[model samples]
Target chain A: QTVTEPVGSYARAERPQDFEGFVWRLDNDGKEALPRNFRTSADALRAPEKKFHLDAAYVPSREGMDALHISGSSAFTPAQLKNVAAKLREKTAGPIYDVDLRQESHGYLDGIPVSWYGERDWANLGKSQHEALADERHRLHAALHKTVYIAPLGKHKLPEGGEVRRVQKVQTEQEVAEAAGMRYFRIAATDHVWPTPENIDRFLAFYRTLPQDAWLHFHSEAGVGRTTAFMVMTDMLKNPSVSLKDILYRQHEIGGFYYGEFPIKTKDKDSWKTKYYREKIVMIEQFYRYVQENRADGYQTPWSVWLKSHPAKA
Target chain B: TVTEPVGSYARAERPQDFEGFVWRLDNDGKEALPRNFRTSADALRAPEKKFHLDAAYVPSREGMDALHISGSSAFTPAQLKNVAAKLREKTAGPIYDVDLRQESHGYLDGIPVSWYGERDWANLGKSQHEALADERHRLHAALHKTVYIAPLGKHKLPEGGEVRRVQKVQTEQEVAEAAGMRYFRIAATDHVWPTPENIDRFLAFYRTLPQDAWLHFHSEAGVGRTTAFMVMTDMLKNPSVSLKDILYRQHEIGGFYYGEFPIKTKDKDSWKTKYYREKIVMIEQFYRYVQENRADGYQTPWSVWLKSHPAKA
Candidate 1:
């Protein structure tokens, strides 16, 4: 039997509405702060379960599910969409759904779509808009309802029949710029090998194009952690826009361990363990040597130079 | 002009009292603390100064100098009395001055007379009851004050002095007993070093000692310092005292440089210098070996074993 939608059904069926089943909400706060909703058993049995216990099939409304849409465009490849559906099915086994893909034609304003799907009702929709519209029922339901079941359509399954979809493809520079208008990059030194001048220059080339809000994650696994070396490089590239030359200037900042000898080994049972243990002793000795050698005048390591050059960017 | 004593002259003829240094009498109610009296030129110039700054020169009301005295008896030696008069005479050096050696029998009970002869009033009291009366003060000050000065008469100067009085006259037992009393015995190993048995015994002895209120002077040199060998022997005798064992427990305690090692040299030129440096390196190696082997439950060296063993007190 067909059930009539409630008067304020769209408004009442919010993250706050589901009192017994799991509901999905953005965890903008942090990874640990994801929002949740609950549903009751009586509501769980209804056709459009008022209380979704979230164990099975569900459908999207014409105004679309208000909860599924996130703050960005729901853009993904067909493969990624399928993968998302598979993951959702694995998690909840609830019916998979999709938002209605409707298109509206409007005269171009300033060479961009000023009015698009759902724009008449919501207004101010543009090509650059990253968020999905709430009226997209399938997208809203997928974003909100945690339990999504991929209902088998026919002998051959449909691609978009998924509860959630996460993009897995590594986007190229052009693609990233088109999608997010920015990119994040991480380059780190591995093992005991230092990141050479060539490697650093390569990194700087990519680093210069990153947005100011972009995050750069870097770490090292050897003698490079010393303040004299890597720290100096970090200083020369202080400006986010500075290119390869800045990185070249800071290269070779690290010097081999100081003091000709290593400290006593407290742990480790390898041939090079002694050398590893002596690392700190060497560093201290290097400091002493630097102090003594440069006692006469303005001699400073790259580290000190960097600190002097880079007033914190905040 | 000769000035007569204050009692001998009339009040008018005598110099004006001139606000002679009046001191405050303890007034409990006033917030204004005691103030000093003012001195005047007239008061300073009087002959037998009615208020002499050098109070020791004037006799007390009991007719004895207020100076402290030190001797086997209350009576001052004739020589000391003569010395006091000579000190006064020497000040009138190459100029005419009379020497006065007047004697008086009435002396203050606690006040000393030898201080008038230039002895310190504070130290002039006699230890007639024993060799020394202020043992706590003497011992504490001696330990706390780093100065190595000896008490007078106890000074060990060469040539016809007390230096030759007690030279080379002690038995081993006597020396050991003396050292034990002063908490200075050394530990000596009778078995292999770094043994668990020995370490346990040493720890047992150490635990028996009183930790609080004992004056343990730590020095990096000397027999009691980082000399692990010497310390072991000493600890055996005084098993309860705490001494840092630097070999088997290098990392857990103090490090390798603490033990006996060759001096560090910089030149890196001559073979001997190289050898010396290598010897220092070897000492460090030995230290690490001891630490590692001991940590792994291996037997300790004879030397370390002896150090950990309790001494035959």
Candidate 2:
């Protein structure tokens, strides 16, 4: 006899738990990320150049939430930091709110900050690109007196001496940023997946608490998937009346980042890629409904109360 | 079993009207069943649409005999008899209902009941697990004497996971043989590309099938998954045909809507529309694979070919 869940639920035999409590933010980023020549370990080590760079974008003011979307960990030299700050000031005069989506820590290799997502150019300094610039970033944050919002979706595995090591942070990155008198808030999330309803509840609750005039900054590794997703979700949250198409297209026009399609053209064992895509679509679309309903009720209901009253069953 | 002449090939006509990608009572219904089930079932059970099977002779093939495809049906004993009679007239030879429904749905007390087989509000207060199994057994019995619950790929039979379930072949064979027509099984997920192993296994079965047999492929609403399988069958038999024609031919005959084909505009291009776009890419790749292998003299099956050629990123 075969054990089955309800119709439309994806289940895995080995590591079934890994499939649960997660969502797809990209229809098939995995397929897009698949290395065409990944036959050997050496070939696998190499990835697209876009995978390592800091993908940052600026979306002009809408409802006083001018946004800065950045994806990638970087230790900006004082010059780089000044340049970025100048760019933000050009777009918005409000206080910058840094939303760090990386769940991993920023480590120091002999006082130089290292990140979970390794940098390509940082390789020359005898430290892996994984030894990125989070500490330097927090220093910049301290000088600017900007608050850091940290929400880790999942564990990050840093590639080490020819092997990968899982890093469930012991709270160094967020704590150090907070130690510099920077306000910090953490929301739990899973990597490369949609935030669960409960986590999204916390997110919306946090968003409700944010100053409407603040620059809503967002980032994740590569700023492509999670950064783009959160940006879109935040877009939907602010502009409840906007169509998902318009929102995605508007963001795409600025970032050149397209919210990916379902991986119907790709194949995977156990249908993992497909399930992730479907689940993510479900979550994002449902979040759209939640926001619309919240808007419909004259914005009186708090997100936590609204979520508790109208739970996600499907 | 006799092969049809190649000269008989003619493509299906582009539909003047569409059933909105997949036929559903609700405009926003997802491709899978139980979610799409209740609304459609109620509509089908209504006076006007009763006995409406939404079936058709696929109407086009390059090398093989023309086949048929349809959405899954939910009918009373009399309604089923009427449907079978109507289908017999449309089919060319042995009526093979190649059901692709991975989810469970069946008739309970002559009313269609689509449930999770675990616990669902639609279970109507019975012990749903056994209740759904019994319902499926009866429904299969009504269709044929022996339905084969064959599993695809090299994975062990009765594959179980956190999200999917492939029933044990032996038990299904025993139960279905005592009742229904053969239930052709392929492990292709709805609206997603089939794995190489599953495609190879499906090809193996296709090779054994009688040439004149009328294959009726189905999923829930018989659009995305069914058209995918139908186009693959077309590609296999019509190896020399152009990929564009193969896709266009299938799309003309009830295939899912995609870029610049039957529907020329991007009006329907929503988040859901991406699935259609990706499916086109998948079909094109499959056609490329088949044509490449044929030209290069690589007799290796799709599964083996895929071992060396990692799928296009």
Candidate 3:
């Protein structure tokens, strides 16, 4: 018998699960730094690993509290991540308080319908209702943040079968830069080191508008300082209407070098400086002021607001 | 490949040498009498032993110089005899006649078409038009009388495979009765016969009607006879005001008494007498009249008339 599943449901429920539990760190500079996995990355990086444990007594945001408990490796493509984020935003009245990617994986336990906290009472919801929620979630997430899952090559020792893992780092920066191509950018933060919420919002809004075909890269340091910065980048990449290329060019024109390449390195660099300098002069000046004024390691500032109000180039 | 010969043509420039031969004898009344090719009384009596030949020819009544042919074994069924006779009647304007059955078993000497006189022409005529015509003449002769040939069954032969020889003396009465089941009446005299013109017209008219399912049968003989009979019976069967079951019951009643029994008897004390007295009262009366009016071996008067009408009641 010929069988056809709805493309929407199939894409959501039955898509590849190869890279579950893997995490990529996205920085303010539009670069994805490293991939960390509770299983493998902890072994490789000698970092403390967190096990996927089910808390039976955990209270859910909705009626299906009992169904929310789950444990296992779960991966999300950028699209899947965006859809889940969007779904959470639409379902919750609160300001998305916090998004735990692990919770996204646990929301669906044994393929049963459950609240984010793993409740089971929602299992009997009609397919149309589930579909409506899924659609709303997809829209909200698309608006809230941009997502970029690195499409890794053979160098990553992912499982032979099932979904593929998206790589976050390579052996060489040049390799990462080469992979990033035109989408990579360098960020300059003097006093404040982390990515601010305003820049994160800007990044989300900017990356969301990119064509489905484009990729983005955020190169930065490691640890909580870098991880928090990357989270802002992740929020932007996962959101709709955020253009990484435009942000990177704006930063470059404000005397921020392209990665390690400086403005005064060559005569041709002047032309590179001139193009972004003229096109993003307003955002460039504002970004400069934010770096000078902001005191927090990663805080939003008034300069970020000024840049947000300015009309995009025609 | 599932091949089938969909169409065929047969033409006889002239009738074959052995065209009009007879094999049946009418011994129902007066002295045994032979018709068609067989002319002697002894030949009429011993049909199984006699080899009736189409040794001569006679002009058809319609002015065709008809040849008295024999060896009708080529005909698929006895029905083809009537068809050959009808064709002979139609082509009567051309009197070129010969009995090819009497000629050597090979080709017609100077004729343009391939000819095989006595040997089976069933398959041969499928392609050759002239071969079919020659066979038709032989069939016409056999149909006009009775031709006894070697029964194909004795040899465990396949269907449509048979070798036939002619018997002296004609069995016109028997053949005529068989043909009558198909609604064709062959008569020796005019008075007891329906007019040929009327019979032909009726046949043409009958052919126009739709077929009834019940009348269909499996055997070649029964099916052919039933198909022709139902064509005429349908008019009465299809009358809007009439009950189909009632009409069908009446038809069955009539057919059971008349069609099931023979027309004549040898033993005076035979069960046929009782059947005629009770079941076939009308046929019994006619049989008795023919026996009384004509000599002991004379042909029955109703034999020809019965051929034109429906099964006797």
The alpha-carbon RMSD values of the candidates against the true structure, listed in the order shown, are: 39.3, 23.6, 34.8
- Write one digit per residue (lDDT tens) for candidate 3, span A1-314: 64352211122232222212221112111122222211110011121112212232432122111111111112222333233334433333332211221112112211111121101111111223334245334432332222212111111221111111222222222222233222323222111122333334545454345554332323222112222233323322232133433333222222222221123222552343333333333333333344434424343434345444432331
Per-residue CA lDDT of candidate 3, range B1-313, in tens?
2131111011221222222111111111122211121100111121111123122322122200121111111112133334345434433232111111211121111111112221222222122344345444644444322122211221111112111222332222233333332222211111111222323343344344344211111111121122223322332233321222222222332211132234455563353343343333333333333334344433333334334432332
Candidate 1 contains a number of clashing pairs equal to 43
lDDT of 1 at A117: 18
Docking class of 1: incorrect
* Interface C-alpha RMSD, model 2: 21.1
Superposed model 3: Cα runs more than 4 Å off: A1-289, A296-304, A309-314, B1-313
Predicted structure with the largest lDDT when compared to the true one: 2
Candidate 1 lDDT over residue span B1-313, tens digit each: 3242211122122111111110111111122211111111002121122212232322111201111111111211232233234333323221111101111111111111111111111222222122123322333332222111111221111111010111122221232233221222212111112222323444344335443212111111111122233223233333332223222222112212233333443343232343334333333443444444445443554345433432221
Ranking by TM-score: 2, 3, 1
The positional error of residue B123 in candidate 2, measured at the CA in angstroms, is: 66
DockQ of the candidate models in sequence: 0.00, 0.01, 0.00
**How do the candidates score on chain B by TM-score?**
0.21, 0.52, 0.23
